[PDB]
Symmetry: C2
Subunit: 141 residues, 2 copies
């Protein structure tokens, strides 16, 4: 559903939204449901539902816009802390089915992104297996 | 402290780590303290402590490697869900002072990245103010 995709609606002009930046392949704007003041979004213009569906040229342009946006979010003296978050799948907390990078200011212990970081044990043999599968997958793109 | 930066140590070869991919400006490898099985990291070779310190060319290369890595993480049939997370500042849960993108498989409600998503109200006037400041900041990069 690109038809029922609110970011496609913004991109084509069917819903208005103040544009923070625009490049050939990407757009930035403010999140109107922020976790903290200054929370923004960077999206590809292409309707990719997950990051792995995004084109390589689109990936270069989105990476560049993300870095530029982080400088905006870091503030005039660069002291503002922040989290970059991009979700892929509804189990992974993705709501709109279109790639979007959140850049979320962390002003406060009580506001912004709150993360649970509980690690698990993985074996050396399992790490090697995953490293092989991943590198071969990446090598053939 | 690039001297006490474990990712710089990996990058220069002072600590061994199976390399999942390597490009001119970026490296990928497995996280040895994973939140879920297959949790990996994508880092710039440059010692940038936060994303806003990263060069634009390095940003393009890291965006491309991130997209490639997501295809690896999505798996042979692309069904694996995942979160991309990059932290900037110790209040923002950044531990190693070198930019690193986590790509974290979400296999399970009980494993992988766990996120708290409590939004705050922002006014139209505040959104316009932030949009102006951000777009002007981005325009002059
Ligand atoms: Zn869309
Ligand atoms: Zn470093």
């Amino acid at each position: 559903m690109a038809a029922n995709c609110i970011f496609c609606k913004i991109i084509k002009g069917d819903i208005p939204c103040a544009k923070v930046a625009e490049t050939s392949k990407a757009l930035a704007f403010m999140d109107i449901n922020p976790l903290s003041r200054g929370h923004m979004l960077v999206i590809p213009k292409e309707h990719a539902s997950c990051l792995h569906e995004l084109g390589m040229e689109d990936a270069a342009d989105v990476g560049v816009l993300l870095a530029k946006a982080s400088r905006a979010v870091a503030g005039p003296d660069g002291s503002m802390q922040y989290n970059v978050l991009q979700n892929n799948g509804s189990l992974a907390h993705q709501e709109v089915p279109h790639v979007h990078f959140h850049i979320i200011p962390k002003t406060d212990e009580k506001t912004g992104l709150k993360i649970g970081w509980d690690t698990v044990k993985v074996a050396s043999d399992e790490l090697a297996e995953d490293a092989k599968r991943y590198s071969e997958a990446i090598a053939k793109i």
